[PDB]
Amino acid sequence: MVPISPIETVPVKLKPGMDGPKVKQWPLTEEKIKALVEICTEMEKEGKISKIGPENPYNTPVFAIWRKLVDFRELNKRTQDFWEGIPHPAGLKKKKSVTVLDVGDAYFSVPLDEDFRKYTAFTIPSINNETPGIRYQYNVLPQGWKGSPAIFQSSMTKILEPFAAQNPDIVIYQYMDDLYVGSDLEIGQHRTKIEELRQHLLRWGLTTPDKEPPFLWMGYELHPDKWTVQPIVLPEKDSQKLVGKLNWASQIYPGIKVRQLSKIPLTAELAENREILKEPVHGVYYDPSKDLIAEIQKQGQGQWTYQIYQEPFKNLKTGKYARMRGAHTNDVKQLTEAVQKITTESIVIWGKTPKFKLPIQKETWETWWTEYWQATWIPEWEFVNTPPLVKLWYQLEKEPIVGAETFYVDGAANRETKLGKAGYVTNKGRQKVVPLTNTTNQKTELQAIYLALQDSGLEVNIVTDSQYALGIIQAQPDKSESELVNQIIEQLIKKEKVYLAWVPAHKGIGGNEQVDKLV
Amino acid sequence: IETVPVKLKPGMDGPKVKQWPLTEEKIKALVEICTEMEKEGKISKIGPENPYNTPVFAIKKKDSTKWRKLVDFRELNKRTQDFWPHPAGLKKKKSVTVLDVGDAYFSVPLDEDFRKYTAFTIPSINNETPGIRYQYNVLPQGWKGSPAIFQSSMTKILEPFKKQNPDIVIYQYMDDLYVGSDLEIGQHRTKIEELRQHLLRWGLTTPELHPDKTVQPIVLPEKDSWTVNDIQKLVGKLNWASQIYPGIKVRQLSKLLRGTKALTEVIPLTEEAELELAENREILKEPVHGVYYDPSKDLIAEIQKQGQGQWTYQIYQEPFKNLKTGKYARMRGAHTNDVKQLTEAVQKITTESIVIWGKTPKFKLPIQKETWETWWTEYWQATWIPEWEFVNTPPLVKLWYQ
Ligand SMILES: C=CC(=O)N(C)CCOc1ccc(Cl)c(Oc2cc(Cl)cc(C#N)c2)c1
Numbered sequence: 001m002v003p004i005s006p007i008e009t010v011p012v013k014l015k016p017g018m019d020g021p022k023v024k025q026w027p028l029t030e031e032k033i034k035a036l037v038e039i040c041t042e043m044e045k046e047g048k049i050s051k052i053g054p055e056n057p058y059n060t061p062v063f064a065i066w067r068k069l070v071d072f073r074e075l076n077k078r079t080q081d082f083w084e085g086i087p088h089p090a091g092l093k094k095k096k097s098v099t100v101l102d103v104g105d106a107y108f109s110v111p112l113d114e115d116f117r118k119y120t121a122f123t124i125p126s127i128n129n130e131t132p133g134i135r136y137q138y139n140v141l142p143q144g145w146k147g148s149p150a151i152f153q154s155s156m157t158k159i160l161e162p163f164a165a166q167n168p169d170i171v172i173y174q175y176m177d178d179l180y181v182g183s184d185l186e187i188g189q190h191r192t193k194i195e196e197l198r199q200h201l202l203r204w205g206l207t208t209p210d211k212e213p214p215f216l217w218m219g220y221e222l223h224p225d226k227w228t229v230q231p232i233v234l235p236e237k238d239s240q241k242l243v244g245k246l247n248w249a250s251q252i253y254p255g256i257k258v259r260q261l262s263k264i265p266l267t268a269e270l271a272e273n274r275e276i277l278k279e280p281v282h283g284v285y286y287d288p289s290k291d292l293i294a295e296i297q298k299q300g301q302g303q304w305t306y307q308i309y310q311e312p313f314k315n316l317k318t319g320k321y322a323r324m325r326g327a328h329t330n331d332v333k334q335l336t337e338a339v340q341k342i343t344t345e346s347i348v349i350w351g352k353t354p355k356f357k358l359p360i361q362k363e364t365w366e367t368w369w370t371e372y373w374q375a376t377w378i379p380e381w382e383f384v385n386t387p388p389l390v391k392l393w394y395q396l397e398k399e400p401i402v403g404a405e406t407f408y409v410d411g412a413a414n415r416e417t418k419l420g421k422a423g424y425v426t427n428k429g430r431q432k433v434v435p436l437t438n439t440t441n442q443k444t445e446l447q448a449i450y451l452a453l454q455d456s457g458l459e460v461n462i463v464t465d466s467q468y469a470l471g472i473i474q475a476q477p478d479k480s481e482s483e484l485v486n487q488i489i490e491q492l493i494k495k496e497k498v499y500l501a502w503v504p505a506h507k508g509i510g511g512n513e514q515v516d517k518l519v
Numbered sequence: 520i521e522t523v524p525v526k527l528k529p530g531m532d533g534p535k536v537k538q539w540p541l542t543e544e545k546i547k548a549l550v551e552i553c554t555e556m557e558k559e560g561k562i563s564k565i566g567p568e569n570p571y572n573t574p575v576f577a578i579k580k581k582d583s584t585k586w587r588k589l590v591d592f593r594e595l596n597k598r599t600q601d602f603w604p605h606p607a608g609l610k611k612k613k614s615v616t617v618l619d620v621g622d623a624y625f626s627v628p629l630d631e632d633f634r635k636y637t638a639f640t641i642p643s644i645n646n647e648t649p650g651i652r653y654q655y656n657v658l659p660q661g662w663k664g665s666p667a668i669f670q671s672s673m674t675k676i677l678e679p680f681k682k683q684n685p686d687i688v689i690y691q692y693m694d695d696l697y698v699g700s701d702l703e704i705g706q707h708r709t710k711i712e713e714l715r716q717h718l719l720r721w722g723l724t725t726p727e728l729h730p731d732k733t734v735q736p737i738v739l740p741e742k743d744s745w746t747v748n749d750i751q752k753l754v755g756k757l758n759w760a761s762q763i764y765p766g767i768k769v770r771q772l773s774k775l776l777r778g779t780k781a782l783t784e785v786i787p788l789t790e791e792a793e794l795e796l797a798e799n800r801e802i803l804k805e806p807v808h809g810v811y812y813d814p815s816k817d818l819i820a821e822i823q824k825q826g827q828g829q830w831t832y833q834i835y836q837e838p839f840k841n842l843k844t845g846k847y848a849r850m851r852g853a854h855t856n857d858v859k860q861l862t863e864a865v866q867k868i869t870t871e872s873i874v875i876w877g878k879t880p881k882f883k884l885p886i887q888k889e890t891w892e893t894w895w896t897e898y899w900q901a902t903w904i905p906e907w908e909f910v911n912t913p914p915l916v917k918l919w920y921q
Contacts, residue, residue, distance in 0.1 A: 010566050010567060010568050011566075011568055012568060013568075080568070080570070081570040082567045082568065082570060083566075083567045083568075083569060083570055083572075083652065085646040086646055087645050087646050087647050088645060088646075091644070091645030091647070092645075147567070150567040151567055153567075153649065154566060154567040154649075157648075157649055173647065333887075336887075336890065337887075337889055337890075340889045340890055340893045341889075343893055344540060344893060347540040347541070347542055348540045348645065348646075349644075349645050350543075350644065350645070351541075351542050351543030351546065351644040351645075352542055352543060353542075369857060370826065371826070373823075373824060373885060373913045373914075373917065374824065374885045374886050374887060374913075375824055375857035375858050375860070375861045375884075375885060375886045375890070375891075376857055376858070376886070376887070376890055377856055377857055377858040377859075377890065377894060399748075400746070400748045400782035400783050401782075401783075402783045405781075406747075406779070406780070406781050406782045408779050425779045426779060427779050427780055427781040427784075461781075461782045463751070463782070467915060470915065471912055471913065471915075474913040475912070475913060499782070501748060501751060501752075501782065502755065502915065503751050503754065503755060504754065504755055504758040507754060507758060507769055507773050508769075508770065508773035508774060508776070508777070509751060509754060509773055509776045510776045510777040510778045510779055510780065511776075511778070511779035511780070513779075
């Protein structure tokens with residue numbers, strides 16, 4: 001008899017105002033009852049459960065498949081909440097040796113809070129229901145109870161805390177009923193330290209017996225030098241799962257595209273994706289001594305792809321970013337948002353911001369943020385000359401243009417008929433009014449600006465009273481849902497100088513020709 | 520000596536806020552800070568039976584090269600029961616100094632039943648190890664109940680200094696003391712050292728502000744030659760101001776804009792137009808009519824980026840009834856970083872708002888949520904944190920404040 005240190009129990013209580021479970025035991029067959037009786041007798045002989053009298057008014061149903069299955073769904077619904085994020089392999093650091101240990105015997109060795117055991121009561125029905133069924137309650141964390149994973153991992157972590165503190169030269173990872181220990185020591189010293197851990201676990205009475213890499217873990221394969229997703233094979237079909245698997249493959253296979261399949265057969269086929277999703281690709285592990293680099297490319301249609309690496313051509317991981325769903329957008333905003341996501345993902349996985357390589361000129365970025373009406377910022381980055389380059393497509397003037405014709409524009413529409421008009425008058429006497437069907441005030445205000453853009457020289461001043469149109473153009477979109485806006489954008493790209501001025505409507509500002517447009 | 524009873528609001532549970540990702544240097548700083556606080560008994564490890572959580576991070580205050588722990592107690596503060604005064608003269612004082620008195624709270628124990636609600640998590644890089652989980656034993660920094668509880672002891676340490684210097688206005692907001700004096704700058708610096716020494720005698724350990732000249736006037740250009748464009752922008756600004764000031768009129772000025780003229784053509788002002796401009800000027804010199812403060816309503820702060828390191832802001836409770844407008848133009852290690860500038864502007868506007876009204880405003884930030892949420896903690900230096908929302912549509916009115 002060597003004295004075993006007791007595992008401190010975790011105080012557990014039921015949700016407030018809720019009482020324990022009271023579920024009726026399902027009728028069982030005679031052979032099932034015999035099977036359960038044998039199991040529970042060995043479990044009782046082991047300490048996992050204990051017979052109880054009839055004062056206990058709680059019950060949870062039991063089944064057999066033998067194996068005992070206690071259905072704790074009801075007790076889980078009434079149990080308090082517990083403090084509940086998985087590693088990414090590109091964050092792991094290589095180790096010379098990595099050993100695995102089985103700590104499944106410790107799961108049934110973690111006691112349950114006494115005052116809560118009564119809530120775990122279950123009844124084995126008796127043969128022909130002519131005696132009272134056998135009554136048991138749990139003394140250990142029941143597999144299937146709400147608090148078992150959180151209490152189990154928490155108890156193991158407290159046990160391993162002194163060992164990890166006194167051995168900074170090793171690393172311990174807890175996953176399911178197995179512990180993973182790695183180090184960079186010589187194979188002799190590393191196997192020594194594993195024996196110390198078994199000794200240390202014996203101080204709490206935990207028995208470890210005496211996987212082989214590659215490890216298969218959470219959909220990955222972890223090799224001593226590389227990692228990759230578990231084999232992903234694109235499917236061959238004539239007539240979501242392809243989305244999830246490509247999204248899962250996107251973290252290592254560069255260039256996955258999921259927009260049209262994310263968008264009922266149709267086309268997609270890009271949807272081959274096989275080119276890469278058929279050749280095998282692997283990521284490297286993290287080396288804290290080398291710098292961390294992230295590179296982004298524009299792929300089109302709001303899609304972006306990126307690689308994070310430390311040495312050229314050996315990626316730690318890869319990814320993609322999709323444009324946010326909106327009415328208007330531009331490339332710089334998207335690239336900014338992609339930078340922010342890669343920034344947060346990198347802080348998660350490596351605890352630092354990567355150095356960025358971006359397809360935008362330094363001068364383009366400076367023009368953008370100094371003139372953008374919002375505050376904006378991307379962390380340290382350098383230009384990489386990988387087309388397509390992100391660029392500004394147009395830039396409005398800050399002052400009226402001398403010698404450029406002045407177009408006063410206006411549009412208006414009837415809410416009932418959907419009939420309206422758009423047009424302009426200029427200082428040279430140029431004039432136009434177009435009649436329109438199936439329109440709104442908003443569309444006619446855009447169309448009036450469009451007309452001025454079409455009918456003016458390379459330099460033009462445009463005067464509108466549309467707060468709606470100025471709201472859109474001041475957002476500096478390079479692409480829209482509205483074909484009207486996209487046609488205005490295409491006209492703005494062809495101009496040399498555009499000055500857009502706003503005036504208040506119906507205040508008597510001249511040229512503001514609400515009368516021609518409302519005729 | 521004896522913990523004060525504390526409870527949450529009726530029908531409300533403790534906070535359960537996700538911890539956001541921290542860099543490795545911030546994690547290490549928190550590990551060292553928290554290990555020390557555990558030894559001092561200020562915090563204690565907790566188990567899986569505690570489900571609550573409040574975010575934590577680390578900062579470096581001004582003129583200090585030491586990391587500091589900041590807890591984002593905003594959720595707990597909202598859910599913490601109101602605890603059963605604001606000096607109108609602090610805003611009128613010539614100068615006001617701000618002293619961090621946060622360590623004082625740690626000498627006071629916290630009600631055992633409430634501690635579970637102060638839980639926080641030091642996170643691990645790459646989710647490798649489980650988060651280090653702690654709860655507070657003593658009054659924590661940034662909790663709204665910490666000054667409310669400590670207030671009785673604070674009056675005891677103040678009353679000697681207060682009787683000795685009765686021209687000094689003293690105010691406490693969260694972890695800060697605001698000490699204002701109508702004296703000269705040398706007279707202030709000495710008295711603040713005297714107050715810190717007086718605090719150090721009671722065991723208290725303490726590791727520049729002057730009022731603005733309240734609502735900045737709306738001003739109109741004075742030109743000898745107006746182009747069509749000049750007059751269009753004037754009429755735009757006058758139309759806008761008319762939502763705020765009653766008798767603003769634009770008829771005579773708009774009449775000049777009659778016809779379809781070139782934007783750069785000079786228009787001479789008629790004599791009726793110059794009088795209308797002059798009447799509008801005079802109107803604009805007077806104050807806005809019927810502008811009061813209501814402590815039941817929230818304060819709203821709007822900020823506009825004007826470029827070249829200039830920022831305009833307005834505080835108000837009701838639209839067009841500004842209680843305070845201002846302009847912040849200082850770039851402190853920020854001339855290349857918009858977000859740092861915005862973060863410093865939000866902290867200055869919040870401080871102004873604490874002095875004037877003793878509570879923080881709700882900000883409307885000219886920035887996308889995802890950019891702001893990625894970066895502001897990198898430049899934050901205050902022990903409180905206000906609320907904010909995001910404006911994604913460019914306000915037309917930005918230049919009318921420029
Ligand atoms: C010798 C192998 C090696 O160097 N490899 C695998 C790369 C680095 O990888 C490590 C290092 C150290 C530990 Cl302790 C570890 O152990 C784990 C971690 C996780 Cl997240 C899951 C499993 C499983 N299932 C095992 C892997």
